[PDB]
């Protein structure tokens, strides 16, 4: 609950990293 | 913001949800009913957040909140046991 914000941000980051994982070339 | 989000991405996000809640290397767990229930729950959550959010960031935030809550519950019950 203190570290809640931290983890939430961590999870946000983890989820965002899903955008730039999807590509070809 | 829906114009910039693809079906593929949503699918991947669902999968990420699942893995963050219950990280499993196993293949034989994926065939179990409880796991299927998790994937289903995740799909529902993703749908609800997709409908509710008014921006991509808000969407991510809400998904994250939900993941966090599930994780906390799971941790609490593990400690209890």
């Amino acid at each position: 609950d203190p570290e809640k914000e931290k983890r939430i941000k961590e999870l946000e980051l983890l989820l965002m990293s899903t955008e730039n994982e999807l590509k070809g070339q | 913001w829906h114009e910039h989000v693809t079906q593929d991405l949503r699918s991947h996000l669902v999968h990420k949800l699942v893995q963050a809640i219950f990280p499993t290397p196993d293949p034989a767990a994926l065939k179990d009913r409880r796991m299927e229930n998790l994937v289903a729950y995740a799909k529902k959550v993703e749908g609800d957040m997709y409908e509710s959010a008014n921006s991509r960031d808000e969407y991510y935030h809400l998904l994250a909140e939900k993941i966090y809550k599930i994780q906390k519950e799971l941790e609490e019950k593990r400690r209890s046991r």
């Binding site: - | 409880r34 729950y41 599930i70 519950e73 799971l74 046991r81």
Partner: protein
Amino acid sequence: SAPEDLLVEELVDGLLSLEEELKDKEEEKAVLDGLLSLEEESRG
């Protein structure tokens, strides 16, 4: 999110149960492997 907060409770329990199940299957596997290594060592 009306019945879902309860759903959260069932789902979680299910997952915890599956977790225990898996741990224990791995324990079983380990113990059996152990038995077979013991069997081999006695035989030569």
